[PDB]
Amino acid sequence: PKLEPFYVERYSWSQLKKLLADTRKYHGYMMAKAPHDFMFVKRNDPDGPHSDRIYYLAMSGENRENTLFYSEIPKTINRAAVLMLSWKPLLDLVGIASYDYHQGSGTFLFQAGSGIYHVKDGGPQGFTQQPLRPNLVETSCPNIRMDPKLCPADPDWIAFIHSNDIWISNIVTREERRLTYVHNELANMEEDARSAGVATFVLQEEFDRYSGYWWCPKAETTPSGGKILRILYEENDESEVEIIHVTSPMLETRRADSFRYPKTGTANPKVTFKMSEIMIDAEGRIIDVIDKELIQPFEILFEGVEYIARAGWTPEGKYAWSILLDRSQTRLQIVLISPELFIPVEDDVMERQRLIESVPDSVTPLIIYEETTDIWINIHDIFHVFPQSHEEEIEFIFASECKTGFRHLYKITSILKESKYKRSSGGLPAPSDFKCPIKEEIAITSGEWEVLGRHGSNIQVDEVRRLVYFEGTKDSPLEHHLYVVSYVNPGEVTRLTDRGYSHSCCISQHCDFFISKYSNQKNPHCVSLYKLSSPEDDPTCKTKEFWATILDSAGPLPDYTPPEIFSFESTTGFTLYGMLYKPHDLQPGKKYPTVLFIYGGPQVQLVNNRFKGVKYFRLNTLASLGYVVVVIDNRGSCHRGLKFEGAFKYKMGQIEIDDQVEGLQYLASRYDFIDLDRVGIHGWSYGGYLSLMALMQRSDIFRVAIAGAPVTLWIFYDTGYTERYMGHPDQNEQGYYLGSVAMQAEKFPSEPNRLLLLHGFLDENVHFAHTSILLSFLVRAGKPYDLQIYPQERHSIRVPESGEHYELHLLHYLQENLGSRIAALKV
Amino acid sequence: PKLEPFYVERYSWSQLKKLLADTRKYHGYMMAKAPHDFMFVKRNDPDGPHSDRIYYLAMSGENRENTLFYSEIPKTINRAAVLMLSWKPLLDLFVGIASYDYHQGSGTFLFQAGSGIYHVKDGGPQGFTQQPLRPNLVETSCPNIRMDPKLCPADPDWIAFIHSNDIWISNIVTREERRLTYVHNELANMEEDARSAGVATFVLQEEFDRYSGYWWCPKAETTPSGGKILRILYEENDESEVEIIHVTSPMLETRRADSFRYPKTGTANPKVTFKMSEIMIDAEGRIIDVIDKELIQPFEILFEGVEYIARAGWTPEGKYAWSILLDRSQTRLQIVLISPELFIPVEDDVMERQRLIESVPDSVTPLIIYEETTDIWINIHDIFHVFPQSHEEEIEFIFASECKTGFRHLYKITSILKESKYKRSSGGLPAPSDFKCPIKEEIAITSGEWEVLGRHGSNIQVDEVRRLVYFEGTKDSPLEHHLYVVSYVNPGEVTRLTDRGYSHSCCISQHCDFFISKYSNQKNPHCVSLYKLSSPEDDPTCKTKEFWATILDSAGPLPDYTPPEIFSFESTTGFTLYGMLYKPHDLQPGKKYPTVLFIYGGPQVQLVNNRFKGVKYFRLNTLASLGYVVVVIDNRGSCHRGLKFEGAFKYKMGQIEIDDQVEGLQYLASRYDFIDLDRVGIHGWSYGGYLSLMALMQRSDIFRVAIAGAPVTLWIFYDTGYTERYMGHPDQNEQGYYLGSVAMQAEKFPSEPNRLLLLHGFLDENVHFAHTSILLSFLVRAGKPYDLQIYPQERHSIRVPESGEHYELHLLHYLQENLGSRIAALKV
Ligand SMILES: *C(=O)C(CC)(CC)C(=O)Nc1cccc(CN2CCc3cc4c(cc3C2)OCO4)c1
Ligand SMILES: *C(=O)C(CC)(CC)C(=O)Nc1cccc(CN2CCc3cc4c(cc3C2)OCO4)c1
Ligand SMILES: CCC1(CC)C(=O)N(c2cccc(CN3CCc4cc5c(cc4C3)OCO5)c2)C1=O
Ligand SMILES: CCC1(CC)C(=O)N(c2cccc(CN3CCc4cc5c(cc4C3)OCO5)c2)C1=O
Ligand SMILES: [Cl-]
Ligand SMILES: [Cl-]
């Protein structure tokens, strides 16, 4: 019950710089983009030795660019040996982030730097044995072209965004044309605040939607012998959105860039759907372009809707679908929208009033699903629509947390009958006039575990065997695994991935292969191909066989000791998991200083069975200097269901440190080497927020707090995020005050060397103001602080030298104010 | 010999806060504006006991408003005793007055007090009040704040003021109000609407001390009808081509930035010109019409090469309007007379206007009555006196200049106003020298290795009866300002009127029979006294003074304030360099103490002189009480030592100043062994913060810690008026700008922490935060450590009390933890 304090070696600034540079020079080989965005194409060669060819994006090695590759999948393997697939470069010598494909032609389409290029492979053209030459799509457009997409109905056409307007371009006939005329590149953003086909700030940052336009997958054939291509697009008007200024990166100018930030409780962009009808003749040449708008306003047809979360088309191009949220993000709706709801844009009220009357009353919005929750809707990428058997019906799979409190798959069948509302009557539609009735709603899955549907996780639907492959947490919340089940008569759930690793998978479109990117705490990332088989007596049953390795793991790195995943039964009635790094060369009869690394906000899990030696390598480096490192997933973090996540609704900042302290005390009572008299805390963003709350609330536990890019004041943060978790400010005056660390400056320590603020000066999410206004109050209240600014940096640290300076200063600060001999001398 | 190191008392944050709060809570009497802006008015009462009444502005006591007071000057005194004048309040109150106007003939005061503009009467034909007067609000229909009020000297019923960057006039009797210029629109954006009238732009306020941009003509021209014509000369600026930068808005919740016009060095200054507002008033005192008038030819033609309008006004009879004009490089000054006949009505119609051009004769011309040049720089000042016109062909005036000898001295000049060789009807342009007047005479009223003072209130008073000129100067010592007097007709020897042992700040009665002096010295706080002037009967030129009364009595030696010792040393540069030394309180024998060099070191200031330093630099004493040696040195470049001494760093800022500081620092160490050179800190604000960074960067051997407040890290970001005066245009001094800019030399900073501290007001308009942020950006590239403090609700100066307390607290804790204390020496 005494123990001696260990003190870390007190290196100088120059020495720590060298220590970090030398330890960073070890790794870096494994800082390269692992194979992803896989696609399987069949050879169809009876005599040839390969069944499929697989295309994928990958970084060849370290400083080389991200580009298209391919490997060859054999019909049979040597089951004695282990087949390592070799990577064939698809392209001849600007990274590629994503690519499009068209099965019927073999056309690839992709952006590489400023250019948009295309090649052909695996179509009627056949299969290349040599790298292809990327063919530049020529243009007359002055500025950069973003968001290229192939037209699935016709692979000669592409679309793209230029200066916030939608353009199309033919890659054969070389024709180029502008579809929307909503933005003027010459005017100021104060005057011209409109755009088309592009998601606004909040939708990119807070809902992971980047594109804002969608090709209709089928072409209506014209009497003339040509066709009609279509593009559904969103049109945003940001005029009423507040304009803030953020410091321009060219610091010599002494100027600030304006941008549209919908801070909480203020106006989001004004949104609507539009349709671009494009009449092409028999020669593949544009006859006309008719821009079309909704027959009535968006606010009438889609009452209560703020956000267009997701959108697309049905497989046959009959309807266009959309997933719509209300402002509070407690009501989700899936709505079908017929192209017949759109009429041409017409100035003349005589011509226009006629066009309104030409559309039938039966043609209506069709809300094919609706759900509510008293916690919040979490948007995801799962949504699959089966072919239409009957005109009166539509059949689909969707996921939801709303029923059970865990995300599970549901097969739903809705009825498409005429609306009680009729347009000729000249009234407004009632709240429930467009609701379709639910004929059927089978639960495909259930339990105390979630189906995953974000960050690449999705489903794959086998419509022959009538199965659905999906990722989930059924076996453990610490490991993602691939599963498969019947969607017709949902029996039991067959796990397809091996335990002991967490997996990130995708399934061949043909449903006879899958790939898994897997790792665990001890073993780095690894990518392997697996073949799927049916026992002849029962096609529902699924077994897998290892076929080949795509990327082989590095194996245990020299000097990386991984942590131990622990857990504890909390007083809150929840198992809370954690990671523990023991100090290297652990001296008996001595107690070491502790660093708590934290995030603790929603939509993130720091603790799981994945390799932490690439991202969180410096947690290990801290352990090598003699610091105990702890990481805990408090209440509110993901993969534990909606109830666990909802613990802090309206109450951010109030519960998170209670969990972190409980787990910190669990470890102390068990392991006597943890010195509770010298505990530091450090995080970024929500972690920086919680680090400030820690020092403010619990100065008894935490000696030092190093706050990364703190949210000090929730009124300054955007609509999409802070309203989802904390509601509208007028409906939660208490929670905003208590959740805002800037309002509680007097509660900070009146002794120095305990508070360190870090911030990227040019930050667009967590504006520097959060820090500057906190400082303003700390200065009023006579409180001490230390400050580091990264002047050429936004939220993340992209410039190498800044990242080195962060690491150096952080390691020297912990040393001189927590770990070392001189630290305890100061008191 | 090595001696033992003294370590300062290692107090906690909370304890230092208490220590600082206790040491300033004791005083607070010292933060009160001493009597100033004096004016003597004669009683003219044979039977009455008082000769003059004096009006002045003062702060009654501690946290009270600055307001008008008066005292009574007796005809005789009891020479046995000392008379203390009592302060009679002029005003009823029922805010704060920075300045006032007066009209002798009527008794009319005029002054702004917060939002309002008021007026009272005392000491005219009305007579003299024995009770406080009620200030009479000047009523208005103008929605926004009215600034820069001025009485019309030709008619005290009329005033003028600026409202939303346009000139207005208002009658305080008839209650009429009217706008004269229509140059600005309050509703438009500053990006579009970049014009103004009657207001000095940024650079002229900050770098040339001109705040007003309009000037009443002192006389009215009588009309045939029976009314009159009042005139107002004004400058009109167009800031359209001036660069627009963004400074963070004080309302930090908005996340926004105010636009403002900053003439970055090398770039465009505002486009300027003169204008005249001709105002026809009838016999009733009511406006008939207002004709706005412009220069018959452009400013760039009539005043070739001129960038800045430094100063302007009128001659005493209102015949000519004068102006003092600089070129861009500020190496050529010109005094120019401008007749109202040079101005013509503003007319859209090209036919009507072309006729009006021809109506003005060719003989009517700009008249450059003086011109001078220098290869160092012109320093602008407020001295310029014009005598009445005896002859039509001549003009006679006093002016001061450093251009002849290299020290500022007075000169009586007589110039000839002959017609110009250039003639306007010819339709050509004028040559450079076509408007130069010949100099008939140029007598030197003073000379020597010392300067006449003409800035910050220092001026001259001209006795036109006895033909004398009173002035402030450094003749006796560069450490003491003194009042002197001399003949301007037959300039003999100068008679010092102030006592030695104090530095003085004086003004002289308009009637030249009294003067007042605000004086102090290193041991004694500030004191304001009245002195009577007398002639011997045999010789009016000779002047003697007699003490008459005290206006503000000194507080006497403060409790706990030990003042410093002024020292000096012969520099290797061939200059005497003066300094100030604070010894540690309770000086132990055989021990060596940590030293703090407090510095400014830039141009136009002198830190070392014989004045009381216990108000503003009180906390230098507080540093001495904790056991720090404190040093302050005036290196080359600082003022009151002539132009050559000041010129030392032309094109070379940053290169020479630390050599002088180190030399004096080593003089003191070789003399006093209690200075520990192993623990020397440096601290300054603005140019001081700049030099603090240079000190650490250049001489890391000498300076352990550098604490830089609002540093100029990069001279290309600073304004036209200042940096071009001292460093020239960037393209003509690529070497000096690079070497003078600390941000371009970040690699030369220490690679070891606890040595560099940056302090900055986040909302600073002069030295924009970018100086710091861009320096940091380079320090981060080069892997260098720094400590940073930001005062988010603060501009260049610290106005908010809490911010000032946090500066003092953090500064004291920093020096403690990284220089002075026990723990400090362990950290290395
Ligand atoms: C700081 O923590 C933060 C919020 C105060 C600043 C932006 C933040 O949330 N940062 C952050 C950084 C990296 C990754 C994430 C997680 N990500 C947030 C947005 C998001 C949006 C959608 C989603 C999942 C995420 C997760 O699924 C659908 O939309 C957060
Ligand atoms: C920092 O030192 C500084 C320059 C980098 C920032 C503004 C600066 O010069 N500061 C400063 C603060 C207080 C007082 C002065 C001196 N003052 C400057 C302007 C000036 C203008 C005229 C003058 C005398 C001065 C002196 O006489 C005529 O015009 C400077
Ligand atoms: C952005 C989202 C997310 C979680 C998905 C998150 O939040 N972070 C996040 C935040 C801060 C820091 C780091 C990496 N850090 C680990 C801590 C540390 C500690 C050191 C050091 C470097 C580093 C690097 O040098 C010395 O001591 C990662 C994420 O990613
Ligand atoms: C603005 C122009 C001028 C010269 C007329 C100048 O330049 N300054 C100027 C600059 C910096 C600081 C101070 C006052 N300081 C003195 C140093 C000091 C040192 C302390 C402390 C407070 C202070 C206050 O607390 C602890 O240790 C004054 C001028 O004014
Ligand atoms: Cl089906
Ligand atoms: Cl005379």
UniProtKB/Swiss-Prot annotation, chain A:
Record note on what altering residue 763 to A does: Abolishes activity; no effect on subcellular location
Tissues showing expression: Ubiquitously expressed, with highest levels in testis, placenta, prostate, muscle and brain.
Lineage top rank: taxon: Eukaryota
UniProt effect for mutating residue 718 to E: Loss of enzyme activity. Loss of dimerization
Broadest EC class assigned to this enzyme: hydrolase
Keywords: Aminopeptidase, Apoptosis, Cytoplasm, Hydrolase, Protease, Serine protease
Activity across pH: Optimum pH is 7.4-8.5. Little activity below pH 6.5.
Result for mutant: residue 795 to A: Abolishes activity; no effect on subcellular location
Principal location class: cytoplasm
Enzyme Commission numbers on file: 3.4.14.5
Localization per Swiss-Prot or TrEMBL: Cytoplasm
Regulation of its function: Inhibited by zinc. Inhibited by the serine proteinase inhibitor 4-(2-aminoethyl)benzenesulphonyl fluoride (AEBSF), and by di-isopropylfluorophosphate. Specifically inhibited by isoindoline derivatives. Inhibited by Val-boroPro (Talabostat, PT-100), a non-selective inhibitor, which triggers pyroptosis in monocytes and macrophages.
Induction: In activated T-cells.
Entry's Gene Ontology cellular component terms: cytoplasm; cytosol
Bilayer-crossing regions: none
Molecular functions per Gene Ontology: aminopeptidase activity; dipeptidyl-peptidase activity; serine-type peptidase activity
Catalytic reaction(s) noted: Release of an N-terminal dipeptide, Xaa-Yaa-|-Zaa-, from a polypeptide, preferentially when Yaa is Pro, provided Zaa is neither Pro nor hydroxyproline
SUPFAM superfamilies registered for this protein in UniProt: alpha/beta-Hydrolases, DPP6 N-terminal domain-like
Functional description taken from the UniProt entry: Dipeptidyl peptidase that cleaves off N-terminal dipeptides from proteins having a Pro or Ala residue at position 2. Acts as a key inhibitor of caspase-1-dependent monocyte and macrophage pyroptosis in resting cells by preventing activation of NLRP1 and CARD8. Sequesters the cleaved C-terminal part of NLRP1 and CARD8, which respectively constitute the active part of the NLRP1 and CARD8 inflammasomes, in a ternary complex, thereby preventing their oligomerization and activation.
Family of this protein: Belongs to the peptidase S9B family. DPPIV subfamily.
Quaternary state and interactors: Homodimer. Forms a ternary complex with NLRP1, composed of a DPP8 homodimer, one full-length NLRP1 protein, and one cleaved C-terminus of NLRP1 (NACHT, LRR and PYD domains-containing protein 1, C-terminus). Forms a ternary complex with CARD8, composed of a DPP8 homodimer, one full-length NLRP1 protein, and one cleaved C-terminus of CARD8 (Caspase recruitment domain-containing protein 8, C-terminus). In the ternary complex, only one subunit of the DPP8 homodimer is bound to NLRP1 or CARD8.
Name listed for the protein in its UniProt record: Dipeptidyl peptidase 8
Source organism of this protein record: Homo sapiens
Taxonomic path: Eukaryota, Metazoa, Chordata, Craniata, Vertebrata
From Swiss-Prot, chain B:
Regulation of its function: Inhibited by zinc. Inhibited by the serine proteinase inhibitor 4-(2-aminoethyl)benzenesulphonyl fluoride (AEBSF), and by di-isopropylfluorophosphate. Specifically inhibited by isoindoline derivatives. Inhibited by Val-boroPro (Talabostat, PT-100), a non-selective inhibitor, which triggers pyroptosis in monocytes and macrophages.
Consequence when changing residue 719 to A/S/V: Strongly reduced enzyme activity
Major localization listed first in the record, in broad terms: cytoplasm
Keywords: Aminopeptidase, Apoptosis, Cytoplasm, Hydrolase, Protease, Serine protease
Family the UniProt entry places it in: Belongs to the peptidase S9B family. DPPIV subfamily.
Summary of the function given for this chain in its UniProt record: Dipeptidyl peptidase that cleaves off N-terminal dipeptides from proteins having a Pro or Ala residue at position 2. Acts as a key inhibitor of caspase-1-dependent monocyte and macrophage pyroptosis in resting cells by preventing activation of NLRP1 and CARD8. Sequesters the cleaved C-terminal part of NLRP1 and CARD8, which respectively constitute the active part of the NLRP1 and CARD8 inflammasomes, in a ternary complex, thereby preventing their oligomerization and activation.
Record protein name field: Dipeptidyl peptidase 8
Annotated organism of origin: Homo sapiens
Gene: DPP8
